[PDB]
Design a protein around this nucleic acid. Sequence first.
RNA 1: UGCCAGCCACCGCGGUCAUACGAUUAACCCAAAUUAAUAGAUCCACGGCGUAAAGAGUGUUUAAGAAAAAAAAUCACAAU
Lengths: 220, 97, 86, 135, 99, 130
Amino acid sequence: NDLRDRILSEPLKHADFFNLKELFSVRSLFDARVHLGHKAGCRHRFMEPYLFGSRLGQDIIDLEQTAAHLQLALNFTAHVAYREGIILFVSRHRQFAHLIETTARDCGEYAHTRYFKGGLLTNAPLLLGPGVRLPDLIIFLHTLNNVFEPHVAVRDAAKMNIPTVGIVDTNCNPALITYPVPGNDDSPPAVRLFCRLFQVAISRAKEKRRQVEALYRLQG
Amino acid sequence: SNEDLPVPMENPYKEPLKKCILCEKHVDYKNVQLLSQFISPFTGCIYGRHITGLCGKKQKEITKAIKRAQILGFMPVTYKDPAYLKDPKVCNIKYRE
Amino acid sequence: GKATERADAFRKAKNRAVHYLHYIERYEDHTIYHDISLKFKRTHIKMKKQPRGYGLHCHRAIMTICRLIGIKDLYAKVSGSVNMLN
Amino acid sequence: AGSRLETVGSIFSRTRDLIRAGVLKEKPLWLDIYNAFPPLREPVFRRPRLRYGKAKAAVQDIFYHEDRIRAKFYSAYGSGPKAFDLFNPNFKSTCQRFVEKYIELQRLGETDEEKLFVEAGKALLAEGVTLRRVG
Amino acid sequence: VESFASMLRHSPLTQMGPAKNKLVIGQIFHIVEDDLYIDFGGKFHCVCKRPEVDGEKYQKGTRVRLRLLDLELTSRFLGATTDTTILEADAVLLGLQES
Amino acid sequence: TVDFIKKQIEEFNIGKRHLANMMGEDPETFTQEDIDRAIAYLFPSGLFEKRARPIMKHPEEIFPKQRAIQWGEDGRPFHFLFYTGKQSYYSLMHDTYGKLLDVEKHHNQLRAKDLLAEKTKILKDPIGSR
RNA sequence: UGCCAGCCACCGCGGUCAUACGAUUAACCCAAAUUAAUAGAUCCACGGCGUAAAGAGUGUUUAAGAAAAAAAAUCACAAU
Ligand SMILES: [Mg+2]
Ligand SMILES: [Mg+2]
Ligand SMILES: [Mg+2]
Ligand SMILES: [Mg+2]
Ligand SMILES: [Mg+2]
Ligand SMILES: [Mg+2]
Ligand SMILES: [Mg+2]
Ligand SMILES: [Mg+2]
Ligand SMILES: [Mg+2]
Ligand SMILES: [Mg+2]
Ligand SMILES: [Zn+2]
């Protein structure tokens, strides 16, 4: 038991424990059309600090702050996977649902790209089973549903005290998202880049957890 | 210290505003040929903005000129003059289908 | 908690009150940090910080709420509406 | 059990104060991660109130001195013969070549707009691009 | 280290400027019976109709030429706080990578 | 309820052995067809509803099918679509869509290579397929 | 007893169906005092005026009040 707390305390003492800086850069985000957002009329009021400007009606997201938020979001996602946490990729968008399902299957985490039932996260002991374990992290690839309204899961995670890492567009509300990352969720290159980043972060976290366990076995 | 920052300047891509057909023109009460183009040949009604397509001043000026000419004895009220009936069509209303 | 039977309503209220819990910052565990003047929908509440020897001279419901919270000394006045829920 | 209140504050605060009071006797695994790497903004609920009156958003439009030459190029020649390729990161367009010629002509000590325009238009013929003026 | 403003100033979209009557190159990524989803690459994907001439030559991955009309179709209506995004773009078909 | 079904299996086996012994047939050759006749003869319940008659089948046949244990001892669910409500239906839909995409890519490659070797097998009128 | 007798500061109670009427027991609070009535102290708004009471049918002006940081006066169209 004494050696178990050391494993959990090891990554908390280092800033870049999993070396996630090499995964992306400003140019990598720029090449994926991340900086591009909706028109000025679709701009949310809370998205003003997360915007670089407006290019003839279309607002532009500042990739400097995009990457600044993305570093923390990826570090938080990697730590949850390292600490054996349940990660649920929730996204309601009928274009990349198969890609999200495949990325989650490859990660070994859980996914939800279909219609979200009402009492799913709240009335869990009746919707999922007698006794279930709530997801320890919720990842949003598309904050808005098909009705252009905030998703149920972003509110339910805040209600049930579940951290949420979410890609927020210019028309999204980052108020309830624990780790919002301003970007574009409608570009296929951007969504593929985000899926690959969240895939490699989880893969590295699990591989490093396995290596740390192997070292712990040799410790005694 | 960055020289690539945007500058708060005027929009260079500002398109010119659309002009009415009589923009920067002189409307008169004596040009019955001009006044007849905005009236119905069969009834004599004065076409509205959605039919003519004139910006705010010229529609009212044409209406006033038509009303003045119909009473001064220059243009018939009940019908359009067959002499000016063969004028080019400026209105956007189609009757015969 | 609302139910056809009184016992069922009591049980539902007891079971559903735990899910909604606030944390109250209590100065020295006896009073509040500063005087609070709040205006709800139609109820105005004016609460003033009180010393050790002035214990719960408030409305009969605010006194019970503060006793359950842990506040031992407080003065409060309610003006306007007297609706219990508000 | 916990606190299902949304508008009161943030999840970190609502999880920390519960343990501080002693209701939540089990510390969540994500609380340590939040303490180690807090986000830039605390996840507190903010109501999107509508903006009325003379108040306007603080977002500023994106414009450069290059746009003042691009508008002139598009007014006369319009879209260039070479179609734009958005896939290529380092793609240079016909108007990009025109503005690159224009800045060098400005550096050459020419202040007249006609001199800066017609000279670039004729110099593009040296490279060999076709300009289609719109009448 | 290149800056975001520096790369945005040299971005092809910035050079394009207004999206009215601009010739662009797009690549088709999805195929329907009569509709073609062409990704011109700016933000969204436009939808066009297969022409009568050389209709069979339009396949998945084919590169075509477009005359872009609007980058994103949004409009305001009665009682609408924000715009109604169409999640698409307006463009027309002219040719298929004439080279 | 796994141990209940496990005990019911043993009870069914011993009851089948005793039924074969009391009926006089070989327990090795004793089958469900003989079980039905033995039950009908020993307990002649005359009722119009056949489900109301006495029945002795395997526990997996009598008791309804049970949903598998969705999560391990650590609490982590097994299937990646557990939080979707209908994990089996959604996995079937996902597999169908993945196979559709694979078929589309393969057919696109075949069309690019100018190879048409597939046939139309959708018409199953003579077979009577629904 | 049974909308009868009757009781009450407000709500209200009286059905061969009364913990509210009359009687008994029991119980509670005061106390050489206990109730009823009349007087008092206190209690209305430093609050509102679209739908509950409230923006007076309109403009100008006397008295009176604030000028607390700076700006402005005037143009198509049916005032009279
Ligand atoms: Mg979006
Ligand atoms: Mg009495
Ligand atoms: Mg009686
Ligand atoms: Mg009484
Ligand atoms: Mg009595
Ligand atoms: Mg006395
Ligand atoms: Mg009052
Ligand atoms: Mg009134
Ligand atoms: Mg009035
Ligand atoms: Mg009156
Ligand atoms: Zn005009």
